[PDB]
Amino acid sequence: LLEKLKKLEEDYYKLRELYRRLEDEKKFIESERIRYEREVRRLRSEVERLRSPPLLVGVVSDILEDGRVVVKSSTGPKFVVNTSQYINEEELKPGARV
Amino acid sequence: LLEKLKKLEEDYYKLRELYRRLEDEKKFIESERIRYEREVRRLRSEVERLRSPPLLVGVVSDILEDGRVVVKSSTGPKFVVNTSQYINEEELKPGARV
């Protein structure tokens, strides 16, 4: 009928507007993704500066559960340095090269 | 009447759909956004802690009544160092590794 066609016209109209705002929102989201993509390549490069030399072999002295590792360096001195998600401390042991 | 409402109902019904198609294409870009957000946070946090100065290990060989503590360094030589307030020199005695 006449009533039924008025129910659907308004329904599409409201849904139309909803998606319309959302299409701009997600265009803007894209701009945000370029900003974060760049940050990932930068922050990874800092990691790759670590993977580059100057590098120094130290051999693990003991492992602490406070979230630190005592490493006896081959230079001489032992030092306490924090853990990372670029290692496992399971794999670390007294006498583990690192 | 029925025909009049129908023409308008078609144009909106068409525009509805068109926005919903672009919304799908962009939905992957947003998924990438959220993904890269995590990769941004993770990388920066771990590189910061590792970049932070490494902390040398010492062993208290002696202690002064002047409120300084004489710490034999893991390099080899001995130094006279100042106590904090995190750690007080009555939380320490000779042989406490610090």
Curated annotation (Swiss-Prot), chains A, B:
Keyword hit for Coiled coil: yes
Coiled-coil boundaries: 1-52
Top-level taxon of origin: Archaea
Any GO BP: proteasomal protein catabolic process
CC per GO annotation: cytoplasm; proteasome-activating nucleotidase complex
Record's keyword terms, sorted: ATP-binding, Chaperone, Coiled coil, Cytoplasm, Nucleotide-binding, Proteasome
GO MF term list: ATP binding; ATP hydrolysis activity
Cellular compartment(s): Cytoplasm
Principal location listed in the UniProt entry: cytoplasm
Keyword Cell membrane annotated: no
Function: ATPase which is responsible for recognizing, binding, unfolding and translocation of substrate proteins into the archaeal 20S proteasome core particle. Is essential for opening the gate of the 20S proteasome via an interaction with its C-terminus, thereby allowing substrate entry and access to the site of proteolysis. Thus, the C-termini of the proteasomal ATPase function like a 'key in a lock' to induce gate opening and therefore regulate proteolysis.
Family according to the record: Belongs to the AAA ATPase family.
Assembly and binders: Homohexamer. The hexameric complex has a two-ring architecture resembling a top hat that caps the 20S proteasome core at one or both ends. Upon ATP-binding, the C-terminus of PAN interacts with the alpha-rings of the proteasome core by binding to the intersubunit pockets.
Domain notes: Consists of three main regions, an N-terminal coiled-coil domain that may assist in substrate recognition, an interdomain involved in PAN hexamerization, and a C-terminal ATPase domain of the AAA type.
Record's protein name: Proteasome-activating nucleotidase
Organism: Archaeoglobus fulgidus (strain ATCC 49558 / DSM 4304 / JCM 9628 / NBRC 100126 / VC-16)
Encoding gene per record: pan
Interval of the full protein contained in this chain: 9 to 106 of 398
